[PDB]
Amino acid sequence: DRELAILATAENLLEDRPLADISVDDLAKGAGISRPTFYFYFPSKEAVLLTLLDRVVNQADMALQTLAENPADTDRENMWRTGINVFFETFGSHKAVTRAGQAARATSVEVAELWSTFMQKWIAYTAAVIDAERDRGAAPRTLPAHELATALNLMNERTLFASFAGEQPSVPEARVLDTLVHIWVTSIYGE
Amino acid sequence: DRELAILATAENLLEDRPLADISVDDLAKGAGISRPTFYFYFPSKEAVLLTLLDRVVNQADMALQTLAENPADTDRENMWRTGINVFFETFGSHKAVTRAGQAARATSVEVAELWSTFMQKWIAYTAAVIDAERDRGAAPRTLPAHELATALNLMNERTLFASFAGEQPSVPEARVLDTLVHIWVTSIYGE
Ligand SMILES: CC(C)N1CCC2(CC1)CC(=O)c1cc(-c3ccc(C(=O)Nc4ccccc4)cc3)ccc1O2
Ligand SMILES: CC(C)N1CCC2(CC1)CC(=O)c1cc(-c3ccc(C(=O)Nc4ccccc4)cc3)ccc1O2
């Protein structure tokens, strides 16, 4: 629709500059509509970012659900690499939305709640897998699974997004998947 | 001085509310000085936060330097616990400054550079220790030490500060030290 066109313009302009430096008129111009027509589809540029971030987080969540239902037939290290990769490729395919959506957590309760909701889901799934590994005798009973899951997910959020943003310091993007897989596997399976 | 009094007032008020909700007049009132007298000691409330954060980061850095020069005579797990504890206790003793200083990274190049400088120092020290452990045969040669060091430091930044801020999700503050020690030890020593 014109909705899709607003969303594509916003994602395009966020590659060039921050949300603060993009106007409703910039989004309207880019989508080939007037400013009042824009305000019919979105109440604000902030709502546009919230919708883009919702699409990215849901894309990651659905990719992870697909993997859960379709396990790779490979060793445990490659199965964890496949799962972390869902987040590497999904957020890594949408760096501008990832960056702007992380920044908006400070100023938008809706953005903070969206992020919070999905982190709780991803941590709960990670914890359930660690517990199932322990129950089948493949992983030792060390830390409480939900606490370990929490720290590993927060590590991935900070480390992936620092790499994508080219922060100083950061792990090079071409090394971050291997880095995170090593820490997940050693901390889940290590005595 | 009146400087110290401004800094104590600012740290006090940041426990109640964000920097945006604290006025120069609030800091002046709290330190028993006029607004123009305030502007003699600091150009802005933002400079006050930058100075508070500099003091906290330097306190952590000097505590770590003290430990490096005065190793605990205990096993490797307790030596890493002692070192992570420097960051747990120092930032954990200054939660309001930690929280406001992390938020200011978005809006202050000076705050971003301060944080960046010290993270590079702490990562470099972590990497040098991992290399020395590998050289003495106590740790296996797995990931590049500087990349592993980077991810472990970014994990600690995100996980400690989420715990202190009571974010949802977060590791409980009473469990975060043990959580991080487990992940550091398994990822540094694990094959
Ligand atoms: C042990 C063996 C039997 N199998 C292991 C692999 C499976 C099934 C079981 C499937 C998988 O793909 C997976 C992924 C994550 C998972 C969850 C979250 C992240 C993650 O990166 N967060 C993240 C990233 C950015 C921001 C916030 C969170 C990564 C992997 C957690 C468990 C999994 O189980
Ligand atoms: C192996 C054995 C021989 N000894 C291990 C302990 C020692 C000496 C050697 C001393 C120590 O206390 C230490 C601490 C850190 C260290 C560095 C950074 C953090 C950290 O938490 N970041 C952090 C926190 C918040 C925000 C940003 C970074 C923790 C520990 C790194 C190496 C160390 O070596």
Measuring CA to CA, which residue among B132, B130, B177 is closest to residue B149?
B130
Give the number of residues written for chain B.
Answer: 191
**Both tokens assigned to A80:** 């964890």
Task: Give the amino acid at A119.
Answer: M
Residue with tokens 């490979």: A74
Q: Which mutation among B152, B156, B158 tests ligand 2's pocket best, with the greatest number of atoms within 8 A of CB?
A: B156
Residue A48: exposed, middle, or buried by beta-carbon count in 10 A (0-12, 13-18, 19+)? Answer: buried
Looking at ligand 1, which residue's alpha carbon is closest to its atom 9?
A129
In the chain, the amino acid numbered B17 is R
How is residue B183 written in tokens? 């992940």
Domain check: are A40 and A90 in the same one? Answer: no
- CA distance to A26, A79, B17, B108, B119, per residue, from B112 (Å): 29, 36, 21, 6, 11
Report the separation in Å between the CA atom of A19 and the middle of ligand 2, taken as the mean of its atom positions: 37
Please enumerate residues of A whose Cβ is less than 8 A from a Cβ of B. Answer: 103, 106, 116, 119-120, 123, 142-144, 147-148, 150-155, 157-159, 162, 167-172, 175-176, 178-180, 182-183, 185-187, 189-190
Alpha helices in A42-108 (DSSP H): 45-69, 76-92, 95-104
- Domain range for A68 is 45-191
Max CA distance (Å), chain B: 62
Same domain, A119 and A148: yes
Please count the structural domains in chain B: 2
Residues 6+ apart with CB under 8 A from A166: none
Claim to verify: residue B28 and residue B50 sit in the same structural domain: no
What six digits make up the tokens of A31? 């989508």
CA dist list (Å): B60 to B86, B98, B120, B128, B176: 6, 12, 14, 18, 18
- Do A128 and A36 lie in a common domain? no
Quick one: B134 and B124 in the same domain?
yes
Q: Domain check: are B91 and B131 in the same one?
A: yes
Same structural domain, B126 and B155: yes
Give resolution in angstroms. Answer: 1.7
Which two three-digit tokens encode residue B172?
């409980």
Angle at A165 between CA A161 and CA A169, to 5 degrees: 85
CA pair distance B171, B96, nearest whole angstrom: 18
Distance from CA of A152 to the nearest CA of B (A): 8
Side-chain half-sphere CA neighbours of B82 within 13 A:
16
Are A126 and A140 part of one and the same domain?
Answer: yes
Q: What secondary structure letter does DSSP report for A170? A: -
> Looking at the structure, do residues B23 and B113 belong to the same domain, yes or no?
no
- DSSP labels, B18-48: -GGG--HHHHHHHHT--HHHHHHH-S-HHHH
In whole angstroms, what is the distance from residue B139 CA to residue A182 CA?
A: 14
Q: What residue in B sits closest to A120 (Cα-Cα)?
A: B169
